[PDB]
Amino acid sequence: ASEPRAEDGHAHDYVNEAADASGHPRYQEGQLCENCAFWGEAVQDGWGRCTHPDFDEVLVKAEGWCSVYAPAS
Numbered sequence: 001a002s003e004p005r006a007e008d009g010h011a012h013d014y015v016n017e018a019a020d021a022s023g024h025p026r027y028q029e030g031q032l033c034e035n036c037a038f039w040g041e042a043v044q045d046g047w048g049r050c051t052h053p054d055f056d057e058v059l060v061k062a063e064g065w066c067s068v069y070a071p072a073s
């Protein structure tokens with residue numbers, strides 16, 4: 001539905017700014033939700049869907065990141 005914008009730390013060590021998570025060892029450079037293997041599509045104003053149950057709950061910032069990130073490679 002009209003899922004609300006994800007909070008920083010909604011779940012899974014998520015950040016709204018990918019760069020915030022530089023502190024997180026698994027935050028490799030330039031990993032963004034937009035380039036996550038579990039990305040859905042962009043919905044509005046730099047937010048889009050993350051296609052996992054404990055995630056799609058909220059609309060994630062395309063520029064965000066989380067621990068469940070897997071590279072689309």
Ligand code: SF4
Pocket residue numbers: 014032033034036037038039040049050051052055060064065066067068069070
């Ligand atoms: S799995 Fe994480 S990094 Fe990937 S799109 Fe979802 S919230 Fe973003």
